[PDB]
Scaffold this active site. Structure first.
Site, PDB file in Angstrom:
ATOM      1  N   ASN A  82       0.871  -1.288  -0.067  1.00 52.19           N
ATOM      2  CA  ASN A  82      -0.027  -0.175   0.187  1.00 52.19           C
ATOM      3  C   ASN A  82       0.558   1.137  -0.051  1.00 52.19           C
ATOM      4  O   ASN A  82       1.892   1.329   0.584  1.00 52.19           O
ATOM      5  CB  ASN A  82      -0.944   0.059   1.231  1.00 52.19           C
ATOM      6  CG  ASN A  82      -0.340   0.657   2.412  1.00 52.19           C
ATOM      7  OD1 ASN A  82      -0.433   1.699   2.562  1.00 52.19           O
ATOM      8  ND2 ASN A  82       0.076  -0.369   3.486  1.00 52.19           N
ATOM      9  N   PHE A  88      -1.396   8.420   4.264  1.00 52.14           N
ATOM     10  CA  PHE A  88      -2.185   9.090   5.580  1.00 52.14           C
ATOM     11  C   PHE A  88      -3.569   9.627   4.939  1.00 52.14           C
ATOM     12  O   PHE A  88      -3.606  10.914   5.015  1.00 52.14           O
ATOM     13  CB  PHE A  88      -1.320   9.945   6.024  1.00 52.14           C
ATOM     14  CG  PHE A  88      -0.214   9.356   7.074  1.00 52.14           C
ATOM     15  CD1 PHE A  88      -0.501   8.133   7.740  1.00 52.14           C
ATOM     16  CD2 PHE A  88       0.955  10.304   7.494  1.00 52.14           C
ATOM     17  CE1 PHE A  88       0.571   7.912   8.457  1.00 52.14           C
ATOM     18  CE2 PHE A  88       1.579   9.829   8.318  1.00 52.14           C
ATOM     19  CZ  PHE A  88       1.657   8.405   8.786  1.00 52.14           C
ATOM     20  N   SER A 119       5.501   5.310   8.739  1.00 55.85           N
ATOM     21  CA  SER A 119       5.061   5.179   7.584  1.00 55.85           C
ATOM     22  C   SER A 119       5.982   5.430   6.466  1.00 55.85           C
ATOM     23  O   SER A 119       6.758   6.264   6.288  1.00 55.85           O
ATOM     24  CB  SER A 119       3.896   6.106   7.232  1.00 55.85           C
ATOM     25  OG  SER A 119       3.453   5.902   5.887  1.00 55.85           O
ATOM     26  N   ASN A 174       5.242   5.998   3.487  1.00 56.36           N
ATOM     27  CA  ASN A 174       4.607   6.632   2.404  1.00 56.36           C
ATOM     28  C   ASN A 174       4.228   8.128   2.566  1.00 56.36           C
ATOM     29  O   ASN A 174       3.611   8.851   1.785  1.00 56.36           O
ATOM     30  CB  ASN A 174       3.218   5.971   2.184  1.00 56.36           C
ATOM     31  CG  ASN A 174       3.380   4.527   2.008  1.00 56.36           C
ATOM     32  OD1 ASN A 174       4.308   4.240   1.047  1.00 56.36           O
ATOM     33  ND2 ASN A 174       2.281   3.433   2.416  1.00 56.36           N
ATOM     34  N   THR A 175       5.113   8.751   3.659  1.00 52.74           N
ATOM     35  CA  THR A 175       5.203  10.297   3.704  1.00 52.74           C
ATOM     36  C   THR A 175       6.517  10.658   3.779  1.00 52.74           C
ATOM     37  O   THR A 175       7.367  10.064   4.662  1.00 52.74           O
ATOM     38  CB  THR A 175       4.344  10.556   4.960  1.00 52.74           C
ATOM     39  OG1 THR A 175       2.987  10.354   4.944  1.00 52.74           O
ATOM     40  CG2 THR A 175       4.590  12.142   5.276  1.00 52.74           C
ATOM     41  N   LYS A 219       5.731   3.628  17.160  1.00 43.55           N
ATOM     42  CA  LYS A 219       5.613   2.598  16.135  1.00 43.55           C
ATOM     43  C   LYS A 219       6.745   2.697  15.077  1.00 43.55           C
ATOM     44  O   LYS A 219       6.906   3.849  14.518  1.00 43.55           O
ATOM     45  CB  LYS A 219       4.300   2.649  15.251  1.00 43.55           C
ATOM     46  CG  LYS A 219       4.122   1.403  14.355  1.00 43.55           C
ATOM     47  CD  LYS A 219       2.840   1.268  13.906  1.00 43.55           C
ATOM     48  CE  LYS A 219       2.656   0.164  12.986  1.00 43.55           C
ATOM     49  NZ  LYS A 219       1.321  -0.067  12.744  1.00 43.55           N
ATOM     50  N   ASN A 224       6.045  -1.463  11.547  1.00 50.09           N
ATOM     51  CA  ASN A 224       5.263  -1.118  10.246  1.00 50.09           C
ATOM     52  C   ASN A 224       5.370  -2.061   9.185  1.00 50.09           C
ATOM     53  O   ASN A 224       6.097  -2.942   9.187  1.00 50.09           O
ATOM     54  CB  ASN A 224       5.586   0.478  10.032  1.00 50.09           C
ATOM     55  CG  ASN A 224       4.448   1.176   9.495  1.00 50.09           C
ATOM     56  OD1 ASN A 224       3.582   0.764   8.641  1.00 50.09           O
ATOM     57  ND2 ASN A 224       3.988   2.371  10.253  1.00 50.09           N
TER      58      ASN A 224
HETATM   59  C1  LIG Z   1      -3.757  -0.869   3.646  1.00 48.15           C
HETATM   60  C2  LIG Z   1      -2.661  -0.722   4.807  1.00 48.15           C
HETATM   61  C3  LIG Z   1      -2.945   0.487   5.412  1.00 48.15           C
HETATM   62  C4  LIG Z   1      -2.124   0.896   6.745  1.00 48.15           C
HETATM   63  N1  LIG Z   1      -2.057   2.288   7.361  1.00 48.15           N
HETATM   64  C5  LIG Z   1      -1.370   2.537   8.487  1.00 48.15           C
HETATM   65  C6  LIG Z   1      -1.421   3.682   9.308  1.00 48.15           C
HETATM   66  O1  LIG Z   1      -2.348   4.424   8.774  1.00 48.15           O
HETATM   67  N2  LIG Z   1      -0.736   3.801  10.275  1.00 48.15           N
HETATM   68  C7  LIG Z   1      -0.055   2.622  10.737  1.00 48.15           C
HETATM   69  O2  LIG Z   1       0.699   2.907  11.838  1.00 48.15           O
HETATM   70  N3  LIG Z   1       0.052   1.749  10.314  1.00 48.15           N
HETATM   71  C8  LIG Z   1      -0.514   1.016   8.976  1.00 48.15           C
HETATM   72  N4  LIG Z   1      -0.333   0.091   8.230  1.00 48.15           N
HETATM   73  C9  LIG Z   1       0.406  -1.186   9.087  1.00 48.15           C
HETATM   74  C10 LIG Z   1      -0.029  -2.043   9.867  1.00 48.15           C
HETATM   75  O3  LIG Z   1      -0.707  -1.328  10.958  1.00 48.15           O
HETATM   76  C11 LIG Z   1       0.896  -3.012  10.235  1.00 48.15           C
HETATM   77  O4  LIG Z   1       1.948  -2.391  10.926  1.00 48.15           O
HETATM   78  C12 LIG Z   1       1.449  -3.685   8.996  1.00 48.15           C
HETATM   79  O5  LIG Z   1       0.484  -3.841   8.062  1.00 48.15           O
HETATM   80  C13 LIG Z   1       1.956  -5.326   9.380  1.00 48.15           C
HETATM   81  O6  LIG Z   1       1.006  -6.178   9.959  1.00 48.15           O
HETATM   82  P1  LIG Z   1       0.004  -7.263   8.896  1.00 48.15           P
HETATM   83  O7  LIG Z   1       1.189  -7.946   8.122  1.00 48.15           O
HETATM   84  O8  LIG Z   1      -0.717  -7.787   9.942  1.00 48.15           O
HETATM   85  O9  LIG Z   1      -0.661  -6.284   7.903  1.00 48.15           O
HETATM   86  C14 LIG Z   1      -1.064  -0.088   7.253  1.00 48.15           C
HETATM   87  C15 LIG Z   1      -1.226  -1.399   6.428  1.00 48.15           C
HETATM   88  C16 LIG Z   1      -1.868  -1.655   5.570  1.00 48.15           C
HETATM   89  C17 LIG Z   1      -1.984  -3.172   4.927  1.00 48.15           C
HETATM   90  O1  LIG Z   2      -1.108   5.815   5.021  1.00 54.18           O
HETATM   91  C1  LIG Z   2      -0.196   4.920   4.694  1.00 54.18           C
HETATM   92  O2  LIG Z   2       0.142   5.155   3.486  1.00 54.18           O
HETATM   93  C2  LIG Z   2       0.438   4.208   5.594  1.00 54.18           C
HETATM   94  C3  LIG Z   2       0.915   4.527   6.802  1.00 54.18           C
HETATM   95  C4  LIG Z   2       1.570   3.514   7.634  1.00 54.18           C
HETATM   96  O3  LIG Z   2       2.126   3.784   8.728  1.00 54.18           O
HETATM   97  N1  LIG Z   2       1.824   2.183   7.376  1.00 54.18           N
HETATM   98  C5  LIG Z   2       1.683   1.888   5.700  1.00 54.18           C
HETATM   99  O4  LIG Z   2       1.841   0.884   5.400  1.00 54.18           O
HETATM  100  N2  LIG Z   2       0.749   3.049   5.020  1.00 54.18           N
END
Ligand SMILES: Cc1cc2nc3c(=O)[nH]c(=O)nc-3n(C[C@H](O)[C@H](O)[C@H](O)COP(=O)(O)O)c2cc1C
Ligand SMILES: O=C(O)c1cc(=O)[nH]c(=O)[nH]1
Ligand SMILES: CC(=O)c1sc(Nc2ccc3ccccc3c2)nc1C
Ligand SMILES: CCCCCCCCCCC[N+](C)(C)[O-]
Length: 364
Positions: free
Chosen positions: A113, A117, A183, A185-186, A223, A252
């Site tokens: 992804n 944000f 993140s 992505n920022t 995080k 993350n």
């Molecule tokens: C589509 C998507 C959006 C995410 N958005 C955020 C976010 O806004 N803030 C954040 O701290 N982590 C975000 N994450 C990270 C997840 O919280 C997690 O740290 C990461 O995906 C690893 O866990 P998983 O393998 O169970 O998905 C996002 C992950 C995915 C897949």
């Molecule tokens: O908003 C996102 O792009 C995002 C934030 C984050 O903390 N981790 C991530 O995988 N995506």
């Protein structure tokens, strides 16, 4: 609600029909409306964990990113999560990156992804949480805490002020806050993990947090990325101990692309999540736990899709775990699956409960 049906029939059908972002939006809607069977798994006492000044009925939470705007909290508890984290939330509303910005890699059970944000902003989320604040107070009391994950706006000059605003606005509504400095992505965000930047940022965050009234005073966690150098990790551990940060979320998504990925979309820009992240995250937990001498609570996250995955993170040093990506492949039944398998494994390995297994690998 029957793993085999969702895993083999319903979820592949949703995948075949909808692009990943549309699927996400529909999932949040369905969840927020409570259109899911109320999960049948009863949490046993051996899954209870006391950490971060709270009781957690079970140690499996929903990771940040699924419910970015705090719309589906109650439906997520109904799904059987022991705690819910919403966000990341930015101070002002912002759109995030242009579409497409989410990609499935089914051959790897992974997602990439680059949302960037997308957020309704502090004001909207604050009102949303206020409307159910007393219900949450009762959920927390009953062992179902709420975390709020804070991000920063794309065009903000002062990163620390963005996070401070989040602490002031959402801190009073949260059991814990997460300073998301990881993140991918920022632009520039991950440099906030560096020693001097992190110290300055977290000093300000903690000052703001300490100025909140006692009953509205959340724990503060940071995080971190799975892509840090050994030096980065040592530095983080040092700052966390110097400042008395309450915990770490590890990890993350990764900007790495491990050898062996098969998905056609493997070269898309963004953070990779799911199975290919799993052991990288587990190893980061193991290192962070040792660097903090086991004294700093860790929420372990990355590639958890089973009881074994959860327990490996717990034994490596996690007090709690989260998942997200697994939900996108297995659906809601994965939650009960992880909890039932975890309990069975704790029993098989001779642990009295989750608490006994935390960091167990380090005592071997
Ligand atoms: C589509 C998507 C959006 C995410 N958005 C955020 C976010 O806004 N803030 C954040 O701290 N982590 C975000 N994450 C990270 C997840 O919280 C997690 O740290 C990461 O995906 C690893 O866990 P998983 O393998 O169970 O998905 C996002 C992950 C995915 C897949
Ligand atoms: O908003 C996102 O792009 C995002 C934030 C984050 O903390 N981790 C991530 O995988 N995506
Ligand atoms: C990125 C994301 O969150 C969505 S979520 C999803 N599938 C679904 C689809 C429906 C769901 C219903 C309840 C809970 C989780 C659900 C997940 N696929 C994707 C790609
Ligand atoms: C007002 C600022 C607009 C923020 C838009 C964020 C996307 C809208 C709903 C998000 C759902 N997600 C796409 C997160 O599932």
């Amino acid at each position: 609600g029957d793993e085999r049906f969702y895993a083999e029939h319903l979820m592949p059908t949703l995948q075949g029909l909808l692009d990943p972002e549309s699927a996400h939006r529909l999932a949040v809607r369905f969840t927020s409306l409570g259109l899911l069977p109320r999960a049948r798994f009863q949490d046993s006492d051996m899954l209870e964990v006391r950490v971060l000044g709270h009781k957690f009925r079970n140690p499996v939470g929903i990771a940040a990113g699924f419910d970015k705007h705090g719309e589906a909290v109650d439906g997520l508890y109904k799904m059987g999560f022991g705690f819910v984290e919403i966000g990341s939330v930015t101070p002002k509303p912002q759109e995030g990156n242009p579409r497409p910005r989410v990609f499935r890699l089914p051959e790897d059970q992974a997602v990439i992804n680059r949302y960037g944000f997308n957020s309704h902003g502090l004001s909207v989320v604050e009102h949303r949480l206020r409307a159910r604040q007393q219900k949450q107070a009762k959920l927390t009391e009953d062992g179902l805490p709420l975390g709020v994950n804070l991000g920063k706006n794309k065009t903000s000059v002062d990163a620390a002020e963005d996070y401070a605003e989040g602490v002031r606005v959402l801190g009073p509504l949260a059991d814990y806050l997460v300073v998301n400095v990881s993140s991918p992505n920022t632009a520039g965000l991950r440099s906030l993990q560096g020693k001097a930047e992190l110290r300055r940022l977290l000093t300000k965050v903690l000052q703001e947090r300490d100025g909140l009234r006692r009953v509205h005073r959340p724990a503060v966690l940071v995080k971190i990325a799975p892509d840090l150098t050994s030096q980065d990790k040592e530095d983080i551990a040092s700052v966390v101990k110097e400042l008395g940060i309450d915990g770490l979320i590890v990890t993350n998504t990764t900007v790495s692309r491990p050898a062996g990925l098969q998905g056609a979309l493997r070269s898309e820009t963004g953070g990779l999540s799911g199975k290919p992240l799993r052991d990288l995250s587990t190893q980061t937990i193991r290192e962070m736990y040792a660097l903090t001498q086991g004294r700093v609570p860790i929420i372990g996250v990355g590639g958890v899709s089973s009881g074994q995955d959860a327990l490996e993170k717990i034994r490596a040093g996690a007090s709690l775990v989260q998942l997200y990506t697994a939900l996108t492949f297995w659906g809601p039944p994965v939650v009960g699956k992880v909890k039932r398998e975890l309990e069975a494994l704790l029993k098989e390995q001779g642990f009295g409960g989750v608490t006994d297994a935390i960091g167990a690998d380090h005592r071997r």
